[PDB]
Coordinates of C-alpha atoms and ligand atoms in Angstrom, one line a residue:
Chain A
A1 CA 99.2 88.3 119.5
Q2 CA 101.9 90.8 118.8
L3 CA 105.5 91.0 117.6
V4 CA 107.0 94.1 119.2
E5 CA 109.7 95.5 116.9
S6 CA 112.7 97.6 117.8
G7 CA 116.2 98.5 116.5
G8 CA 117.3 99.8 113.2
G9 CA 119.1 103.1 112.6
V10 CA 121.3 105.0 110.2
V11 CA 124.7 103.8 109.3
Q12 CA 127.6 104.1 106.8
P13 CA 128.0 101.5 104.1
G14 CA 129.7 98.3 105.2
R15 CA 128.6 98.8 108.8
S16 CA 126.1 96.8 110.9
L17 CA 122.7 97.2 112.6
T18 CA 120.5 94.8 114.6
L19 CA 116.7 94.5 114.5
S20 CA 114.7 92.7 117.2
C21 CA 111.2 91.5 117.8
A22 CA 109.7 90.4 121.1
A23 CA 106.7 88.0 121.1
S24 CA 103.6 88.7 123.1
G25 CA 100.4 86.7 123.5
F26 CA 101.3 83.5 121.7
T27 CA 103.7 80.6 121.9
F28 CA 106.7 81.9 120.1
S29 CA 108.6 78.7 119.8
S30 CA 105.7 77.0 118.0
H31 CA 106.1 79.2 114.8
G32 CA 108.5 79.9 112.1
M33 CA 109.6 83.6 111.9
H34 CA 110.4 85.9 109.0
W35 CA 111.8 89.2 108.1
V36 CA 110.3 91.2 105.2
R37 CA 111.3 94.7 104.0
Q38 CA 110.1 97.5 101.8
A39 CA 112.6 99.8 100.1
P40 CA 111.6 103.3 99.0
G41 CA 109.7 103.1 95.7
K42 CA 109.6 99.3 95.7
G43 CA 107.3 96.5 96.9
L44 CA 107.4 94.0 99.7
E45 CA 110.5 91.8 99.6
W46 CA 111.0 88.6 101.7
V47 CA 114.3 88.6 103.5
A48 CA 114.8 85.6 105.7
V49 CA 113.2 82.8 107.7
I50 CA 114.1 80.8 110.8
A51 CA 112.2 77.6 111.7
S52 CA 110.3 77.3 115.0
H53 CA 113.0 75.5 116.8
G54 CA 115.8 77.6 115.3
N55 CA 117.3 74.5 113.6
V56 CA 117.2 75.8 110.0
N57 CA 117.4 79.2 108.4
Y58 CA 117.1 80.5 104.8
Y59 CA 117.8 83.8 103.1
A60 CA 117.0 85.8 100.0
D61 CA 119.9 85.8 97.6
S62 CA 120.1 89.6 98.0
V63 CA 121.2 89.3 101.6
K64 CA 122.7 85.8 102.0
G65 CA 126.1 85.9 103.6
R66 CA 125.5 89.4 105.0
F67 CA 122.4 89.1 107.2
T68 CA 122.1 86.6 110.1
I69 CA 118.7 85.6 111.4
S70 CA 118.4 84.1 114.9
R71 CA 115.9 83.5 117.6
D72 CA 115.9 83.0 121.4
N73 CA 113.2 80.6 122.4
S74 CA 113.9 81.3 126.1
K75 CA 113.5 85.1 125.9
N76 CA 111.0 84.7 123.0
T77 CA 112.8 87.2 120.7
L78 CA 113.6 87.2 117.0
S79 CA 116.7 88.9 115.7
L80 CA 118.1 90.1 112.4
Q81 CA 121.8 90.9 112.4
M82 CA 122.6 93.0 109.4
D83 CA 126.3 93.2 108.5
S84 CA 128.1 94.5 105.4
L85 CA 125.2 96.9 104.8
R86 CA 124.6 98.4 101.3
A87 CA 122.7 101.5 100.3
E88 CA 120.1 99.3 98.6
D89 CA 119.4 97.7 102.0
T90 CA 117.7 101.0 103.0
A91 CA 114.1 100.0 103.8
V92 CA 111.4 99.6 106.4
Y93 CA 111.9 96.1 107.9
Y94 CA 109.1 94.0 109.4
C95 CA 109.2 90.8 111.4
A96 CA 106.4 88.4 110.6
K97 CA 105.0 85.2 112.2
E98 CA 104.0 82.2 110.1
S99 CA 100.2 81.6 109.9
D100 CA 98.6 78.8 112.0
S101 CA 97.6 75.3 110.9
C102 CA 94.0 74.4 111.8
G103 CA 93.5 70.7 111.3
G104 CA 93.9 70.6 107.5
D105 CA 92.3 73.7 105.8
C106 CA 94.8 76.3 106.9
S107 CA 98.5 76.5 105.9
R108 CA 101.6 78.0 107.5
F109 CA 102.4 79.8 104.3
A110 CA 101.0 83.3 105.1
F111 CA 102.0 85.9 107.6
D112 CA 99.4 86.6 110.3
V113 CA 101.2 88.8 112.8
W114 CA 103.5 91.6 111.8
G115 CA 105.9 94.0 113.6
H116 CA 105.1 97.6 113.2
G117 CA 108.1 98.3 110.9
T118 CA 111.4 99.9 111.7
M119 CA 113.6 101.9 109.4
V120 CA 117.2 101.1 108.3
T121 CA 119.1 103.7 106.4
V122 CA 122.5 103.1 104.8
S123 CA 124.4 106.0 103.4
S124 CA 127.8 107.6 103.1
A125 CA 126.1 110.9 104.1
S126 CA 126.5 112.2 107.7
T127 CA 124.0 114.1 109.8
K128 CA 123.3 117.6 108.4
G129 CA 120.5 120.1 109.0
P130 CA 118.6 121.7 106.1
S131 CA 119.0 125.1 104.5
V132 CA 115.6 126.7 104.2
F133 CA 114.8 129.1 101.3
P134 CA 111.6 131.0 100.6
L135 CA 109.4 130.4 97.6
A136 CA 107.9 133.8 97.4
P137 CA 104.4 134.4 95.9
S138 CA 104.7 135.6 92.3
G139 CA 92.4 134.9 92.9
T140 CA 94.7 132.2 94.3
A141 CA 98.4 132.6 95.1
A142 CA 101.1 129.9 95.9
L143 CA 104.0 130.3 98.2
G144 CA 106.3 127.9 100.0
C145 CA 109.6 126.9 101.4
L146 CA 112.4 124.9 99.9
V147 CA 114.0 122.6 102.6
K148 CA 117.3 121.7 101.0
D149 CA 120.3 119.4 101.7
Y150 CA 119.6 117.5 104.9
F151 CA 120.3 114.0 106.3
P152 CA 118.7 111.7 107.3
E153 CA 115.0 111.7 107.0
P154 CA 112.7 113.0 108.3
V155 CA 112.0 116.7 108.5
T156 CA 108.7 118.1 109.8
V157 CA 107.1 121.2 108.3
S158 CA 104.2 123.2 109.6
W159 CA 102.8 126.6 108.7
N160 CA 102.1 129.4 111.2
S161 CA 102.8 126.9 114.0
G162 CA 100.0 124.7 112.8
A163 CA 97.4 127.4 112.4
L164 CA 97.5 127.1 108.6
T165 CA 96.6 123.6 107.3
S166 CA 94.1 124.2 104.5
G167 CA 95.9 124.1 101.1
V168 CA 99.2 122.9 102.4
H169 CA 101.2 120.3 100.5
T170 CA 104.5 119.1 101.9
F171 CA 106.1 116.9 99.3
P172 CA 107.9 113.6 99.8
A173 CA 111.6 114.2 100.0
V174 CA 113.9 113.3 97.1
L175 CA 117.3 111.8 97.5
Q176 CA 119.8 113.9 95.6
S177 CA 122.9 112.6 93.9
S178 CA 124.8 114.3 96.7
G179 CA 123.3 111.8 99.2
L180 CA 121.3 114.6 100.8
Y181 CA 117.5 115.0 100.8
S182 CA 115.5 117.9 99.7
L183 CA 111.8 118.8 99.7
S184 CA 109.4 121.7 99.2
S185 CA 106.4 122.6 101.3
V186 CA 103.8 124.9 99.6
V187 CA 100.5 126.4 100.3
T188 CA 97.9 128.0 98.2
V189 CA 96.0 131.0 99.7
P190 CA 93.6 133.7 98.6
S191 CA 95.6 136.5 96.9
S192 CA 94.0 139.0 99.3
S193 CA 95.7 137.4 102.3
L194 CA 99.2 138.2 100.9
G195 CA 99.3 141.6 102.5
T196 CA 97.4 141.0 105.7
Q197 CA 98.4 137.4 106.7
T198 CA 102.0 136.6 107.7
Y199 CA 103.2 133.2 106.4
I200 CA 105.9 131.4 108.3
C201 CA 107.1 127.9 107.6
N202 CA 108.3 126.0 110.7
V203 CA 111.0 123.5 109.8
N204 CA 112.3 120.9 112.3
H205 CA 115.0 118.3 111.7
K206 CA 115.4 116.3 114.9
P207 CA 118.5 114.3 113.9
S208 CA 120.5 117.6 113.7
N209 CA 118.4 119.4 116.3
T210 CA 117.7 122.1 113.7
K211 CA 114.7 124.4 114.0
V212 CA 114.1 127.1 111.4
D213 CA 111.2 129.6 111.1
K214 CA 111.2 131.2 107.7
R215 CA 109.0 134.1 106.8
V216 CA 107.8 134.1 103.2
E217 CA 106.8 137.5 101.9
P218 CA 105.5 139.0 98.7
Chain B
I1 CA 107.7 81.6 91.3
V2 CA 106.8 85.0 90.0
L3 CA 103.5 86.7 91.0
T4 CA 102.2 89.3 88.5
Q5 CA 99.6 91.8 89.8
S6 CA 97.4 93.9 87.6
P7 CA 96.3 96.6 87.2
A8 CA 99.2 98.6 88.5
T9 CA 96.7 101.2 89.8
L10 CA 93.0 100.5 90.2
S11 CA 90.9 103.7 90.3
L12 CA 87.5 103.2 92.0
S13 CA 84.7 105.7 92.7
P14 CA 83.6 105.6 96.4
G15 CA 81.1 102.7 96.5
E16 CA 82.4 101.1 93.3
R17 CA 83.2 97.4 93.0
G18 CA 86.7 96.5 91.9
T19 CA 88.8 93.4 91.1
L20 CA 92.5 93.0 91.6
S21 CA 94.3 90.2 89.7
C22 CA 97.3 88.1 90.8
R23 CA 98.7 85.6 88.3
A24 CA 101.4 83.1 89.3
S25 CA 104.1 82.0 86.8
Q26 CA 103.2 78.4 87.6
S27 CA 100.5 76.7 89.7
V28 CA 100.6 77.4 93.5
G29 CA 97.4 75.6 94.3
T30 CA 95.6 77.7 96.9
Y31 CA 98.8 78.9 98.6
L32 CA 98.1 82.6 97.9
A33 CA 97.6 85.3 100.5
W34 CA 96.6 89.0 100.2
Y35 CA 97.7 92.0 102.3
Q36 CA 96.7 95.6 102.5
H37 CA 99.5 98.1 103.0
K38 CA 99.3 101.7 103.9
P39 CA 102.4 104.0 104.2
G40 CA 103.8 104.0 107.7
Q41 CA 101.9 100.9 108.8
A42 CA 102.6 97.1 108.8
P43 CA 101.0 95.1 106.0
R44 CA 97.5 93.9 107.2
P45 CA 96.5 90.3 106.3
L46 CA 93.2 90.2 104.3
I47 CA 93.0 86.7 102.8
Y48 CA 94.7 83.4 103.6
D49 CA 94.9 80.3 101.4
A50 CA 93.3 82.1 98.4
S51 CA 89.8 82.5 99.9
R52 CA 89.8 82.5 103.7
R53 CA 89.2 85.9 105.3
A54 CA 91.6 86.8 108.0
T55 CA 89.8 87.4 111.4
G56 CA 88.2 90.9 111.6
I57 CA 88.3 91.5 107.9
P58 CA 85.0 92.8 106.6
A59 CA 83.1 90.7 104.1
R60 CA 83.5 93.4 101.4
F61 CA 86.9 91.8 100.8
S62 CA 86.8 88.4 99.1
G63 CA 89.4 86.2 97.6
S64 CA 89.0 83.7 94.8
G65 CA 91.0 81.4 92.6
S66 CA 93.2 78.4 92.3
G67 CA 96.3 77.3 90.4
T68 CA 97.7 80.3 88.6
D69 CA 94.8 82.9 88.5
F70 CA 93.7 84.7 91.7
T71 CA 91.4 87.7 92.4
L72 CA 90.8 90.0 95.3
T73 CA 87.4 91.7 95.0
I74 CA 86.4 94.9 96.9
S75 CA 82.6 95.0 96.7
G76 CA 82.4 98.7 97.1
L77 CA 85.4 101.0 97.8
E78 CA 85.3 102.8 101.2
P79 CA 87.7 105.7 101.7
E80 CA 90.1 103.9 104.1
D81 CA 90.4 101.0 101.5
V82 CA 92.9 103.3 99.7
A83 CA 96.1 101.3 100.0
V84 CA 98.6 99.1 98.1
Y85 CA 97.5 95.5 97.9
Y86 CA 100.0 92.6 97.6
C87 CA 99.6 89.0 96.9
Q88 CA 102.0 86.5 98.4
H89 CA 103.1 82.9 98.1
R90 CA 105.2 80.4 100.1
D91 CA 105.6 76.7 100.2
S92 CA 107.4 74.1 102.4
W93 CA 110.9 73.7 100.9
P94 CA 112.7 75.8 99.8
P95 CA 110.9 78.0 102.3
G96 CA 111.2 81.6 100.9
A97 CA 108.2 83.8 100.2
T98 CA 107.4 85.7 97.1
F99 CA 105.3 88.8 96.7
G100 CA 103.5 90.4 93.8
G101 CA 104.6 93.9 92.9
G102 CA 101.4 95.5 94.3
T103 CA 98.3 97.1 93.1
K104 CA 97.7 100.7 94.2
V105 CA 94.0 101.3 94.9
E106 CA 93.0 105.0 94.6
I107 CA 89.8 107.0 94.5
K108 CA 88.4 107.9 91.1
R109 CA 87.0 111.4 90.7
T110 CA 86.3 113.9 88.0
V111 CA 89.2 115.4 86.0
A112 CA 90.8 118.4 87.6
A113 CA 93.4 120.5 85.8
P114 CA 96.4 121.6 87.8
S115 CA 97.0 125.2 88.7
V116 CA 100.7 125.8 87.8
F117 CA 103.3 128.0 89.5
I118 CA 107.0 128.7 89.0
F119 CA 109.5 129.9 91.6
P120 CA 112.9 131.4 90.7
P121 CA 115.8 130.6 93.0
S122 CA 115.8 132.9 96.0
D123 CA 118.5 135.5 96.5
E124 CA 119.4 133.7 99.7
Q125 CA 120.0 130.4 97.9
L126 CA 121.9 132.2 95.2
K127 CA 124.1 133.7 97.8
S128 CA 124.7 130.1 99.0
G129 CA 126.0 128.8 95.7
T130 CA 123.3 126.8 94.0
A131 CA 120.1 127.5 92.1
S132 CA 116.9 125.6 92.4
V133 CA 114.0 126.4 90.2
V134 CA 110.6 125.0 91.4
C135 CA 107.5 124.3 89.4
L136 CA 104.3 123.4 91.3
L137 CA 101.3 121.5 89.9
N138 CA 98.5 122.0 92.4
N139 CA 95.4 119.8 93.0
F140 CA 95.0 117.8 89.8
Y141 CA 93.4 114.5 88.8
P142 CA 94.3 112.0 87.5
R143 CA 97.8 111.5 88.6
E144 CA 99.4 111.3 85.1
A145 CA 101.3 114.5 84.4
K146 CA 104.2 115.6 82.3
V147 CA 106.6 118.4 83.2
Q148 CA 109.5 119.5 81.0
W149 CA 112.1 122.1 81.7
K150 CA 113.5 124.4 79.1
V151 CA 116.3 126.9 79.5
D152 CA 116.7 129.3 76.6
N153 CA 114.5 126.8 74.7
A154 CA 116.9 123.9 75.4
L155 CA 115.2 120.8 76.8
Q156 CA 116.7 119.9 80.1
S157 CA 117.5 116.3 81.0
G158 CA 119.0 114.7 84.1
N159 CA 119.0 117.8 86.3
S160 CA 115.4 117.7 87.6
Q161 CA 113.6 115.7 90.2
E162 CA 109.8 115.2 90.7
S163 CA 107.8 114.5 93.8
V164 CA 104.1 113.8 94.1
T165 CA 101.8 113.9 97.2
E166 CA 99.6 111.1 98.3
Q167 CA 96.0 111.5 97.2
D168 CA 94.3 114.3 99.1
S169 CA 92.0 113.2 101.9
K170 CA 89.4 115.9 101.2
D171 CA 89.3 116.3 97.4
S172 CA 91.1 113.2 96.1
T173 CA 93.6 115.2 93.9
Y174 CA 97.3 115.0 93.6
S175 CA 100.0 117.7 93.7
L176 CA 103.4 117.6 92.1
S177 CA 106.7 119.5 92.5
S178 CA 109.4 119.5 89.8
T179 CA 112.7 121.0 90.8
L180 CA 115.5 122.0 88.3
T181 CA 118.9 122.1 89.9
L182 CA 121.8 124.1 88.3
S183 CA 125.1 125.5 89.6
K184 CA 124.9 129.3 90.1
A185 CA 127.4 129.5 87.3
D186 CA 125.2 127.8 84.8
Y187 CA 122.1 129.6 86.1
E188 CA 123.6 133.0 85.4
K189 CA 124.6 131.9 81.9
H190 CA 121.0 131.8 80.7
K191 CA 118.0 134.1 80.7
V192 CA 114.7 132.3 80.2
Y193 CA 113.5 129.5 82.5
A194 CA 110.4 127.7 81.5
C195 CA 108.2 124.9 82.9
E196 CA 106.0 123.0 80.3
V197 CA 103.1 121.1 82.0
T198 CA 101.0 118.5 80.2
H199 CA 97.8 117.2 81.8
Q200 CA 94.6 115.8 80.4
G201 CA 92.6 118.5 82.2
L202 CA 94.5 121.1 80.0
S203 CA 93.4 121.6 76.4
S204 CA 97.0 122.5 75.4
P205 CA 100.1 122.3 77.6
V206 CA 100.7 125.2 80.0
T207 CA 104.1 127.0 80.0
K208 CA 105.1 129.1 83.0
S209 CA 108.3 131.1 82.7
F210 CA 110.5 134.0 83.9
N211 CA 113.5 136.0 82.9
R212 CA 116.4 135.7 85.3
Ligands
LIG301 C1 112.2 77.1 107.8 C2 111.0 76.2 107.8 O1 111.1 75.4 106.6 C3 110.1 74.5 106.4 O2 110.1 73.5 107.4 C4 108.7 75.2 106.4 O3 108.7 76.1 105.3 C5 108.5 76.0 107.7 O4 107.2 76.6 107.6 C6 109.7 77.0 107.8 O5 109.6 77.7 109.0

């Protein structure tokens, strides 16, 4: 059994997005359906439920009046209409099926089938590619690249077009007060290689179609 | 209903047995489930109705408890058991679910002091109007670390941000970046930039510094 999840996106505050899940391999109309989310740095949060026959719904206080859950028991789909979006609604969203009864021992109070997760980002920032600055090396040396002031997530970083992987750490992005993200990618290498090996950080930001190859030199 | 999970982080050696606790603010009978969650993946059901293993879940995960006190036992940590584990409750009406805050399970290893590096702002960034100073703490264990910025001996507050990698798949260490952000104006107003690093693998804290 699967719930095949789609939708989401990146929008301005006060705007709207839709999420959808399509049922596969079970009888959709026989089960209550839920949405659950996880915001950055936070735990799982229950969002909403709709009963099997779509006759009753219920919402977390945090989203009541702004999100609308619905289902289509003909197309066997589940929807979450998210209106009036707030920055704190930024999260990975999952759809979830109520667990099965089994003649007494099993309850419907767990979640047995989950959608893969789909990202919703709410921000006043608009799409912007990163600036990329070298972190030049001062037995072991460290060097890196600062990938600054981009939106939205994610960026990808490789070194020497993937040839360098040992010792690489690309840090999670931090959201700056500006609303833009920033991260660093570093690598530690033998001090001997500083003179013979070329180090190039390859930065790709698909939302802005930005690609930067920055050489980092002693 | 509030579900309280402890410990916040559970550190286990490979092969070590571990117990995760979930305590409900009032009785929930056996209506208590457990999920495993890894970044970028959907939560994976482990245990239903306090003690029933979800299909396909190996026996090394077991759930116990009733009423207010619940446990998830991992009889011996395997490397891909590193994850955040959540407990969860729901009842008939009202129908909303509640989750515990999560217990992060990580691999325990020997202490490793960080190697520490500092990076002045590049000429390029300076030419672009802002100044970022970066401090790197490389491959340390455990995760607990303290980084403080000083500019001409003045402790900085509110103008730095930290970021930490997930536990390394090969050597089970963490790495950390701390970045101090100043306007170019303020950056050129001062001379000495210093990063003070405290970690239990270090006898006394390490300072890295440079003159602008
Ligand atoms: C919305 C509905 O409410 C109750 O009838 C039960 O909790 C059921 O499992 C749920 O789907």
